Every structure is written in structure tokens, then in C-alpha cells.
Amino acid sequence: MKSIGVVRKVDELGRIVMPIELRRALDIAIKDSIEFFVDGDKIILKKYKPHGVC
Amino acid sequence: MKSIGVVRKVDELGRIVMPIELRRALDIAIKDSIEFFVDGDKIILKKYKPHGVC
């Protein structure tokens, strides 16, 4: 149970379902843009347009 | 371009495709487990089995 407290089980390829919370928190509509970071044993997500920088 | 430097376009619901990098990073096999955190304008991912705690 994290901030969103939601867990997903991978499709197969690694495709999962990010929640409305993510869309709300960020700026997601239907196709948007999410770019990820990986920190050791952690993953990070951002909307591409905002931030701009890595 | 983040650590992975890959960006995804949402399916419609918010479903996107997390990469093999994430599977390698954590412990993803086919269904595995990914639980996310949201920090202001950021998202965080973990495999549920490891960590245990939030």
C-alpha cells in the first residue's frame, strides 16, 4: 500500500494499467506521455511535456 | 530521457507499457506485481513481493 496503494499484474510484455490518480496527479488525458526513471529497484514516472528535462 | 528514458502513450484508461528494463530492475516475469506511489507530480513503482512495506 503506497501513496496510490495500487498494484498491477503485468500483461505479459510489461504492459500494466496506471490509474486515474496518475492522470490527475500529472496531466494525462488519453494518450498524453509518460516517461520513466529507474532507480536501483524503483521506477519513476513523469508526463513528458511538463518538466521537459530528464 | 530519464534513466530508462522511454515515454509511453496511454492506452485510454491509463494503461501503458512498462519495459523489460523494469522487469530486469525489479522482478517482473509475466504477471509479477507493480505497486505505485505518487509524489506531487511524480509516480513511483515497485514490485509488491520485495520491500513488503509501502
Curated annotation (Swiss-Prot), chains A, B:
<comment type="similarity">
    <text>To B.subtilis AbrB and SpoVT.</text>
</comment>
<keyword id="KW-0238">DNA-binding</keyword>
<feature type="domain" description="SpoVT-AbrB">
    <location>
        <begin position="5"/>
        <end position="50"/>
    </location>
</feature>
<keyword id="KW-0805">Transcription regulation</keyword>
<protein>
    <recommendedName>
        <fullName>Putative transition state regulator Abh</fullName>
    </recommendedName>
</protein>
<keyword id="KW-0804">Transcription</keyword>
<dbReference type="GO" id="GO:0003677">
    <property type="term" value="F:DNA binding"/>
</dbReference>
